[PDB]
């Protein structure tokens, strides 16, 4: 399996699932958002002040399913 790794630009949504990110900054991108599991979950999105990395594959970063079905 591979790494995301997508920079946020300015403005962008961002992804955080509240049931399984490991701290506060844990943080998705829209595409590998909506093809994991965690869009049936506690889930909140916010705008990206830009930086930063989408946390796909991040496995440290996640409880529970770390990749979507693009980057598994
Ligand atoms: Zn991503
Ligand atoms: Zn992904
Ligand atoms: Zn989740």
Redesign the pocket.
């Known amino acids: 399996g591979s790494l995301?790794?997508?920079v946020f630009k300015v403005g962008e949504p961002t992804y955080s699932c509240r049931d399984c990110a490991v701290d506060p900054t844990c943080v998705?991108?829209?595409?590998?958002?909506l093809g994991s599991i965690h869009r049936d979950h506690r889930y909140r999105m916010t705008t990206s002040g830009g930086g930063g990395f989408?946390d796909?594959g991040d496995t440290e970063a996640w409880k529970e399913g770390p990749y979507?079905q693009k980057?598994e």
């Open positions: 995301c790794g997508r998705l991108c829209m595409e590998c958002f989408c796909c979507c980057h």
